[PDB]
Structures are given as C-alpha cells and as structure tokens.
Amino acid sequence: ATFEIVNRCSYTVWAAASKGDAALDAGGRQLNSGESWTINVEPGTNGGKIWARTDCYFDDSGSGICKTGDCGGLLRCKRFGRPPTTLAEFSLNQYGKDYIDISNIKGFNVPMNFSPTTRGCRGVRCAADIVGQCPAKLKAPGGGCNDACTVFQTSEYCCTTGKCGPTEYSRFFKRLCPDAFSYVLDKPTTVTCPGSSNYRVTFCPTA
Secondary structure (H helix, E strand, O other): EEEEEEEEEOOOEEEEEEOOOOEEEEEEEEEOOOOOOEEEEEOOOOOOOEEEEEEEOOOOOOOOEEEEEOOOOOOOOOOOOOOOOOOEEEEEEEEOOOEEEEEOOOOOOOEEEEEEEOOOOOOEEEEEOHHHOOOHEEOOOOOOOOHHHHHHHHHHHHHHOOOOOOHHHHHHHHHHOOEEEOOOOOOOOEEEOOOOOEEEEEEEOOO
C-alpha cells in the first residue's frame, strides 16, 4: 500500500512510521513546509502508526531528540514515539478489509487528516486547536497536549482493568475531535476501507 505523507504546516515536522517493533519504509524523514513523502507499507501490516514529531535536532548519524513524538532519539523510527502524538493508525488487509483511524489516546501535537486516495470509504480528521485549548494539567512543556493516562498513570485514565469510562479529560479531546479516539474504550471511530487501499496523511490540513 502507498501512503503519501504531506506536511501542510508552516513549520518543519519529522514524520515517523512504525509498527512498534520495526520501521515502516525508511521509518522517518524531515518534511519542510509543503513537502510530501511517499512510503510503501507491506500488505497485511497490522498496527501501523504514522505521526509527526516537532522541534527535532539530529546529527549526521540520525541520532538526536524531538520535543514531541521522539522514538528513542532516532530519525528513522523503529518504535513508537513519546506522547503527545496525534496518531494515524491502520491495519491493512485484515480479512479483505483495511481499518484506519485517528487517535488522541496518546495525546495531540499536530492536527491531521487521514484520507484514502482510492475509492470506497471516507477519511477522518482531527484539525481543531487542541494545543491552544489544552487544559492546564495536560499541557506538555515541549508543546502539545498530553492524554490523562500519560500524565496521571491511573487505572481509570489508562483503562488498565479493561473497564473504564470517559473522563473530564477524554471528553475534552472528544469535544474538539469527535472523529478521533479519546480514550481506550471510546465508541470506535474506525473507518473500514477496501483491502489494499492507498492513503494520504496530511499534517495541518486546514491551516
């Protein structure tokens, strides 16, 4: 499957793509404002994620630090990134179907649109100003808006027992972005697409 990753933000982001134990394609790349990066993701990939990282410094060996989404200090991510990270999530060719979603379960750093470039399903978007509106206790100094599990580490926020309800904090993410997961047991906003669809992830889709 082909993913075009487009940075429409006015600032540079460092895109990342991983399935948790391995990079997807190169795993990460700088995207200046306007730049597009096309990656190929193997069919049948389960649990892939794409996200943006902000305010990164890397040396010539690809080692460094980012203020949001850092994946162990590497330009080319092999693992998932440190919250807060708006997440494009996908499982491909699962019994003939692709499944995509946007998740705020690990917080929010960059607005995002996640849309198919082929026919047969709708896209999803979380483009509200969540950082600007972020509750005081969830604000991340590096930028972005943390989820409550990351901040407070309770069974309720993290849904550790498999039973949990919405919270004041999850309802904040849900109010601004209804089409993104706001907590683990949120009513699913997953979109079902034809197997082997292709996609575009756009950072800062509106502004």
